[PDB]
């Protein structure tokens, strides 16, 4: 039951150096395997990176800037996938594989490299009423949109006629976009009655310290 | 250069066959390089699935699905298949076909069988027991108005992902935010798309978000009007 070993996240300052290990299990060796290295950014599939046996056996890749190669740890029985002058476009997960003649191809686990330098950005928020189409179908969805923020972390809450609503709440996970900042939703689902029966609904968005809250009103 | 794309169903039910099929273009099928079909659980991570080779259509497959797993070849078609039986939720994913470098770059290496050079885009499929649902689509109208207003449409309660939004047929691109979806606890999905537009453009431009929900075979045009 030979396994690949990856830690599942790794975080470093932009122009550092960094080793990316895949450590095999002690009944395989290292030093027999080429150990291959595949990139994923969000929103796209894996892109071949490089594979590393030894400096006789190794390929770079059409496209792969040189900062990145492959490397071994015989001690640590482990592939290395080493990094240099780190750009924050290196923001990727990062996946190992070898070839084993019983166990076929084994992935690890993945390692979500992360860059530590981004600023803080604050939230841009757009609330949406319910459509009138909606309305007439005795329905109304309240649809708060997030963007532009950075930490992904972010906290929604919902208020109707300023006081906490507790219930009809869904708040997706934040994404990342094509900016590197990220990105969320949270919709309140009502009916028509509930919609007509407050003056006033509210998105709440805290991130970090502070938070930006948008108000529609019925009619 | 050597297309590759999946395609099939984007939802089987359990204990049914998912059945995928990877169109190449612009390259041969045959040739000392595997074809291989690997996927992705949603946020998962990546899991080999099998291979047949180019050259000898022979087929070696994952030893824990040995038993529930086919790939085979169509040559008059150029296009191989993936057939995947007796599914479960555990087999929810994006599938990807892929193609190993030539004979050439491997000099002694062994195959290149776990080298993937060239990918498919993938296609998700959903194994679960809940029937597919379209979309309905209502306008996000914008709104005082600020000097950029946001329009939009929400695409709300449909079954399978994906979607996919364009607007106005894809001539407007700048300032188009399609978000995740969302999914309820009654198991619908829902997801909206926002393109925010300078104020002067509500009195000129005409805005249709373009809705496509494939696994119900349903589009929507939708004119997001402004009231």
């Known amino acids: 039951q030979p396994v690949l070993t990856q830690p599942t996240s790794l975080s470093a300052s932009p122009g550092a150096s960094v080793r990316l290990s895949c450590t095999l299990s002690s009944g395989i060796n290292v030093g027999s395997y080429s150990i291959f290295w595949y990139q994923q950014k969000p929103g796209s599939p894996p892109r071949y990176l490089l594979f590393?046996?030894?400096?006789?056996?190794?390929?770079?890749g059409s496209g792969v800037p040189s900062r990145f190669s492959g490397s071994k740890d015989t001690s640590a029985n482990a592939g290395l996938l080493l990094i240099s002058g780190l750009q924050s476009e290196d923001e990727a997960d990062y996946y190992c594989?070898?070839?084993?003649?019983?166990?076929?191809?084994?992935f690890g686990g993945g390692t979500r490299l992360t860059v530590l330098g981004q600023p803080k950005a604050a939230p841009s928020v757009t609330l949406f009423p319910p459509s009138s189409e909606e309305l007439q179908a005795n329905k109304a969805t309240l649809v708060c949109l997030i963007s532009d923020f950075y930490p992904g972390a972010v906290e929604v809450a919902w208020k109707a006629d300023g006081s906490a609503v507790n219930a009809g709440v869904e708040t997706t996970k934040p994404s990342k976009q094509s900016n590197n900042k990220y990105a969320a939703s949270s919709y309140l689902s009502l009916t028509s009655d509930q919609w007509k029966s407050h003056k006033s609904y509210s998105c709440q968005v805290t991130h970090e310290g502070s938070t930006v809250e948008k108000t529609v009103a019925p009619a | 250069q050597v297309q590759l794309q999946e395609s099939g169903p984007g939802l089987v039910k359990p204990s049914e066959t998912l059945s995928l099929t990877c169109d190449v273009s612009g390259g041969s099928f045959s040739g000392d390089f595997y074809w291989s079909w690997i996927r992705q659980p949603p946020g998962k991570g990546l899991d080999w699935i099998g291979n047949?080779?180019?050259?000898?259509?022979?087929?070696?497959?994952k030893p824990s699905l040995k038993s529930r797993v086919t790939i085979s070849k169509d040559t008059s078609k150029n296009q191989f298949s993936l057939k995947l039986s007796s599914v479960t939720a555990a087999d929810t994913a994006v599938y990807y076909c892929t193609r190993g470098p030539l004979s050439r770059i491997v000099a002694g290496f062994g195959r290149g069988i776990n080298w993937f050079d060239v990918w498919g885009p993938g296609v998700l499929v959903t194994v679960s027991s809940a029937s597919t649902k379209g979309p309905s689509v209502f306008p996000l109208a914008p709104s005082t108005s600020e000097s950029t207003a946001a329009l939009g449409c929400l695409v709300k309660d449909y079954f399978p992902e994906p979607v996919t939004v364009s607007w106005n047929s894809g001539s407007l691109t700048s300032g188009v935010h399609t978000f995740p979806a969302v999914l309820q606890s009654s198991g619908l999905y829902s997801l909206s798309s926002v393109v925010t537009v300078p104020s002067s453009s509500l009195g000129t431009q005409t805005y249709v978000c373009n809705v496509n929900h494939k696994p119900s075979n349903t589009k929507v045009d939708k004119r997001v009007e402004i009231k």
């Open positions: 594989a070898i070839w084993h003649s019983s166990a076929s191809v084994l």
């Open positions: 047949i080779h180019g050259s000898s259509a022979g087929t070696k497959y």
């Open positions: 590393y046996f030894s400096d006789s056996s190794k390929h770079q």
